[PDB]
Design a protein around this motif. Sequence first.
Motif, PDB file in Angstrom:
ATOM      1  N   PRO A  59       0.788  -1.239   0.000  1.00 16.89           N
ATOM      2  CA  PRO A  59       0.000   0.000   0.000  1.00 16.89           C
ATOM      3  C   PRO A  59       0.819   1.286   0.000  1.00 16.89           C
ATOM      4  N   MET A  60       0.364   2.255  -0.790  1.00 18.57           N
ATOM      5  CA  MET A  60       0.797   3.640  -0.648  1.00 18.57           C
ATOM      6  C   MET A  60      -0.437   4.526  -0.516  1.00 18.57           C
ATOM      7  N   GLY A  61      -0.315   5.611   0.246  1.00 12.50           N
ATOM      8  CA  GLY A  61      -1.442   6.508   0.436  1.00 12.50           C
ATOM      9  C   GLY A  61      -1.037   7.965   0.573  1.00 12.50           C
ATOM     10  N   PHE A  62      -1.958   8.870   0.250  1.00 15.07           N
ATOM     11  CA  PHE A  62      -1.688  10.296   0.382  1.00 15.07           C
ATOM     12  C   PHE A  62      -2.974  11.097   0.513  1.00 15.07           C
ATOM     13  N   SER A  63      -2.905  12.195   1.252  1.00 12.03           N
ATOM     14  CA  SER A  63      -3.978  13.176   1.243  1.00 12.03           C
ATOM     15  C   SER A  63      -3.657  14.220   0.182  1.00 12.03           C
ATOM     16  N   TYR A  64      -4.684  14.907  -0.305  1.00 10.11           N
ATOM     17  CA  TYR A  64      -4.488  15.989  -1.259  1.00 10.11           C
ATOM     18  C   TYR A  64      -5.305  17.199  -0.847  1.00 10.11           C
ATOM     19  N   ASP A  65      -4.613  18.291  -0.549  1.00  3.03           N
ATOM     20  CA  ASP A  65      -5.270  19.526  -0.152  1.00  3.03           C
ATOM     21  C   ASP A  65      -5.256  20.511  -1.307  1.00  3.03           C
ATOM     22  N   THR A  66      -6.441  20.817  -1.827  1.00  2.20           N
ATOM     23  CA  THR A  66      -6.582  21.827  -2.869  1.00  2.20           C
ATOM     24  C   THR A  66      -6.528  23.215  -2.244  1.00  2.20           C
ATOM     25  N   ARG A  67      -5.780  24.112  -2.877  1.00  2.00           N
ATOM     26  CA  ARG A  67      -5.709  25.490  -2.416  1.00  2.00           C
ATOM     27  C   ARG A  67      -7.070  26.161  -2.599  1.00  2.00           C
ATOM     28  N   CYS A  68      -7.650  26.618  -1.493  1.00  2.00           N
ATOM     29  CA  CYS A  68      -8.942  27.302  -1.499  1.00  2.00           C
ATOM     30  C   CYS A  68      -9.939  26.694  -2.487  1.00  2.00           C
ATOM     31  N   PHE A  69     -10.475  25.532  -2.131  1.00  2.00           N
ATOM     32  CA  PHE A  69     -11.231  24.709  -3.062  1.00  2.00           C
ATOM     33  C   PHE A  69     -12.473  25.387  -3.648  1.00  2.00           C
ATOM     34  N   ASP A  70     -13.269  26.024  -2.793  1.00  2.00           N
ATOM     35  CA  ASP A  70     -14.505  26.670  -3.233  1.00  2.00           C
ATOM     36  C   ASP A  70     -14.266  27.627  -4.397  1.00  2.00           C
TER      37      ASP A  70
ATOM     38  N   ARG B   5     -18.306  34.035  -9.009  1.00  2.00           N
ATOM     39  CA  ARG B   5     -18.421  33.055 -10.085  1.00  2.00           C
ATOM     40  C   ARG B   5     -17.738  31.730  -9.729  1.00  2.00           C
ATOM     41  N   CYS B   6     -17.887  31.325  -8.471  1.00  2.00           N
ATOM     42  CA  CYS B   6     -17.360  30.052  -7.986  1.00  2.00           C
ATOM     43  C   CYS B   6     -18.334  29.487  -6.957  1.00  2.00           C
ATOM     44  N   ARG B   7     -17.940  28.421  -6.269  1.00  2.00           N
ATOM     45  CA  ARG B   7     -18.812  27.815  -5.267  1.00  2.00           C
ATOM     46  C   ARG B   7     -19.227  28.818  -4.195  1.00  2.00           C
ATOM     47  N   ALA B   8     -20.501  28.790  -3.820  1.00  2.00           N
ATOM     48  CA  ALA B   8     -20.942  29.480  -2.618  1.00  2.00           C
ATOM     49  C   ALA B   8     -20.859  28.529  -1.419  1.00  2.00           C
ATOM     50  N   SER B   9     -20.345  29.029  -0.305  1.00  2.00           N
ATOM     51  CA  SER B   9     -20.122  28.202   0.872  1.00  2.00           C
ATOM     52  C   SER B   9     -21.394  27.951   1.672  1.00  2.00           C
ATOM     53  N   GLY B  10     -22.382  28.828   1.516  1.00  2.00           N
ATOM     54  CA  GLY B  10     -23.575  28.745   2.343  1.00  2.00           C
ATOM     55  C   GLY B  10     -24.860  28.390   1.613  1.00  2.00           C
TER      56      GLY B  10
ATOM     57  N   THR C  50     -26.281  22.755  -1.652  1.00  2.00           N
ATOM     58  CA  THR C  50     -25.488  21.840  -2.469  1.00  2.00           C
ATOM     59  C   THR C  50     -23.969  21.963  -2.282  1.00  2.00           C
ATOM     60  N   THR C  51     -23.530  22.803  -1.349  1.00  2.00           N
ATOM     61  CA  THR C  51     -22.095  23.007  -1.151  1.00  2.00           C
ATOM     62  C   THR C  51     -21.335  21.705  -0.870  1.00  2.00           C
ATOM     63  N   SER C  52     -21.810  20.926   0.094  1.00  2.00           N
ATOM     64  CA  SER C  52     -21.135  19.687   0.481  1.00  2.00           C
ATOM     65  C   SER C  52     -21.159  18.657  -0.645  1.00  2.00           C
ATOM     66  N   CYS C  53     -22.353  18.389  -1.156  1.00  2.00           N
ATOM     67  CA  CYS C  53     -22.547  17.413  -2.220  1.00  2.00           C
ATOM     68  C   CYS C  53     -21.825  17.849  -3.493  1.00  2.00           C
ATOM     69  N   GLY C  54     -21.963  19.126  -3.833  1.00  2.00           N
ATOM     70  CA  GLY C  54     -21.323  19.644  -5.028  1.00  2.00           C
ATOM     71  C   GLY C  54     -19.812  19.545  -4.952  1.00  2.00           C
ATOM     72  N   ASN C  55     -19.241  19.924  -3.811  1.00  2.02           N
ATOM     73  CA  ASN C  55     -17.797  19.831  -3.645  1.00  2.02           C
ATOM     74  C   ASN C  55     -17.336  18.381  -3.612  1.00  2.02           C
ATOM     75  N   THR C  56     -18.154  17.500  -3.043  1.00  2.00           N
ATOM     76  CA  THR C  56     -17.772  16.100  -2.939  1.00  2.00           C
ATOM     77  C   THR C  56     -17.837  15.431  -4.316  1.00  2.00           C
ATOM     78  N   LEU C  57     -18.933  15.637  -5.039  1.00  2.00           N
ATOM     79  CA  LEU C  57     -19.027  15.154  -6.412  1.00  2.00           C
ATOM     80  C   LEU C  57     -17.881  15.686  -7.261  1.00  2.00           C
ATOM     81  N   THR C  58     -17.615  16.985  -7.156  1.00  2.00           N
ATOM     82  CA  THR C  58     -16.616  17.622  -8.009  1.00  2.00           C
ATOM     83  C   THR C  58     -15.194  17.213  -7.632  1.00  2.00           C
ATOM     84  N   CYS C  59     -14.949  17.035  -6.340  1.00  2.00           N
ATOM     85  CA  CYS C  59     -13.636  16.599  -5.894  1.00  2.00           C
ATOM     86  C   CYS C  59     -13.371  15.174  -6.350  1.00  2.00           C
TER      87      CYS C  59
END
Length: 558
Positions: free
Chosen positions: A209-220, A273-278, A281-290
Amino acid sequence: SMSYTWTGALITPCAAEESKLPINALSNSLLRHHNMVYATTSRSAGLRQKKVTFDRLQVLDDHYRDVLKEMKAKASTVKAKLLSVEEACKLTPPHSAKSKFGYGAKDVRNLSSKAVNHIHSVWKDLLEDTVTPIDTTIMAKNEVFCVQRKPARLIVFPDLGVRVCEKMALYDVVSTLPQVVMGSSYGFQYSPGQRVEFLVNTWKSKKNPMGFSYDTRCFDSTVTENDIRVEESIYQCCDLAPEARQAIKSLTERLYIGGPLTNSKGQNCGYRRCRASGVLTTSCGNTLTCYLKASAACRAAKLQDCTMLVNGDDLVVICESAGTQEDAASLRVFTEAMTRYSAPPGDPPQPEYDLELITSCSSNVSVAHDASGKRVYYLTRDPTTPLARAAWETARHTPVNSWLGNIIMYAPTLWARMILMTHFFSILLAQEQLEKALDCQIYGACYSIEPLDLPQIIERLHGLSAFSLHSYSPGEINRVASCLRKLGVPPLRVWRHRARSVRARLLSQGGRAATCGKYLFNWAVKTKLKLTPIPAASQLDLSGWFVAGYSGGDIYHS
Ligand SMILES: CN1CCN(c2cc3c(cc2F)c(=O)c(C(=O)OCc2ccc(Cl)cc2)cn3Cc2ccc(S(C)(=O)=O)cc2)CC1
């Protein structure tokens, strides 16, 4: 192309904001170095604006297209229902931000005809007009941290009447669709105990096994208008009622893809012109898109035997290692693919070969032993922020009690048992409020929980072992140690003494209170009690606790 454009109008507070930890003896007994604890305010708003304002470039390829086609196909098996107005009203938190149209959350919850009438007009407007951008408010969030300062976060949300219509049109969809599309990769379907099981087994299932996390810079802000239309097309694959389809199309074009930003004083602050945090669909949209971008990136990087776990913008990947050198190169390709898709890294991802060293959702898997000496994996994290916030919530009154949510999520850990349980159960004893229900957030959703229920909740979520874990890993204890030193918190010696006092007093009260004393604090005494299953554990209604993420989606349950 530009995530935000700004008028120059300031993001303004709605009431006075505290950034300093006040000093009393009760809070100071928890934490000494109070000067390290701060809360963000609108005073750092402009600094955040700089970070989140940038141009987005995006290049799709065949991997992206193949993965989307696969998602739509699974989404096509979903049948989602419209919520009635009354159902949507019940989902509204009691202290949700009131409408500017002359009614508030309690009016909504009460089914006031002024509120319901307006919500009908908003809805009818959604159906009739699918063009005019819908207004949103932008606020700086007031969040507590520990120094090394973070600029406040920005929250963007529509009016209460719109949010209710969101629930009607899309609540069912965002509650069911993600798990169908992404299957086991969908992070919010797991309790913490379940997330550990999936991770541990996924790791053990790999030959090397190999594993890693990936942090996108300011995802929204990296989320494009195309991204947001792509999610919409995925929603539309669902078997939907014609009204729902029309409302979803409208909310997408008028609210989700972007819109005008209005500050606390009603000034125009600019345009998004990007994701709204509030929004809902924020959670689902970001999860689908990620998931879509990372799944395709895994293919571009030719990662072998990939398993993903996705919670909003938080990504962890576990795969078969091709060798240390090849792994490093693979991750660079992966990163390059993500970047082309518009999701550049905040920090370059790094290969790991020990599950415990992978951090996702600010947490990691660690190990300890139950009474029988048997190995037990449990979810943990660095205690710093949870402790800083516990200090704040001891020194001030706040609507959300993060300590309570942390106790529930991190009950097995040394620091939640030793400090949080001891500290707050001690406080509730003094105030005689053991019976009083408190609000905490779980995966974005607000729940009212009775502290005296904690033993059963913990047994249901983590199992009886949660009350007898010992011999924790040295690395984990070293991290707690470092945190206690940094913040100036008492050692195990002090907390054990306090816990024995709290345990004694809880016992003398009998009832559920004695049960808290017996189960939560059995670690504090040298002669241990037996601790059998709590017969009340199996009577708990926990069916909806870990189904989907709702951060920013204005959801309340029970
Ligand atoms: C260099 N040393 C090596 C040993 N290390 C550990 C030391 C270990 C345990 C495991 C360790 F790896 C452990 O499992 C355990 C154990 O299982 O004790 C029973 C217990 C105690 C509290 C709870 Cl809530 C649960 C179980 C108790 N201790 C002692 C200890 C001392 C001080 C603190 S602190 C930093 O919080 O002041 C924590 C722990 C500390 C650093």
